[PDB]
């Protein structure tokens, strides 16, 4: 369904936030 | 539908947050 | 509809968070 | 309606988060 | 209604996040 | 009801995020 | 119910974000 | 159900955000 589809797109975007934070953590290690 | 499209707009906005955090990560790199 | 309208206002606010984070990233570059 | 009005209150709160992050960005500027 | 009530409690908690970020911004000014 | 109670649990978790950010603000103060 | 169950899992994940931020605050104290 | 499963995917994504913030906390530790 389209509402479940759209909530799965929200989950994917949250995972992109997680990956960006991981990239931030690597920059702080530097 | 209207509600699924609005949820998809929320996902896109979350992706824009991820891109902004990547810009932050890059700024820390130096 | 008013619920879709309100979810689109949530998306707009999330984009304002993204823009604030971009401004933060520019400050870290400094 | 009650639920749309509550979702609009959530959007306003997210905007307050954006303003707070702008204050953070300004504090980093110096 | 109880669902609108609970969404207004979510808005209040988001405002508490905003206030904490403002306190963070003041600490960075220091 | 079950759903309102779960939304209230989400609000409480967001408040715990606010408290953690206050701890971060205090750590920056020195 | 499964939707209330899933919203309680979202609350638990938000508490894990709070705990991670507390760990961050301890690192800034250092 | 589809919607509960999508909400559970959102919880998992939030947990990935928590793990990324823990990586950030560790990077600050030194």
Author numbering:
A (entry chain A), B (entry chain B), C (entry chain A), D (entry chain B), E (entry chain A), F (entry chain B), ...: 1 to 30
From the paper:
We targeted two properties of αHBs: oligomeric state, which directly affects the internal diameter of the channel; and the identities of channel-facing residues, which fine tune this dimension and introduce different chemistries. The αHBs are loaded with an environment sensitive dye (in this case, 1,6-diphenyl-1,3,5-hexatriene, DPH) that binds within the channels and fluoresces. Accordingly, challenging the array with analytes leads to differential displacement of the dye across the array to give a fluorescent fingerprint.
Despite the requirements for aliphatic residues at a and d, up to 40% of these can be changed to other side chains without compromising barrel integrity. We introduced mutations at one or two of these sites to generate four groups of αHB: Group I had entirely hydrophobic interiors, but with different sizes and shapes of channel; Groups II and III had polar uncharged or polar charged residues, respectively, at specific points along the channel; and Group IV had aromatic residues installed in their channels. In detail, the sixteen Group I peptides included: previous designs for a pentamer, 3 hexamers, 2 heptamers and an octamer all verified by X-ray crystallography;27,29 single and/or double mutations to Ala and Gly at central a and d sites to generate larger channels; a single-Pro mutant at the final d site to kink and open the C-terminal end of the channel; and a variant with all a sites made Met to vary the hydrophobic chemistry used. Finally, one third of the designs were crystallized and yielded 12 X-ray crystal structures, all of which were open αHBs with fully accessible channels. Conversely, the FAs generate signal through interactions with the more-hydrophobic and aromatic-containing channels (Group I and IV).
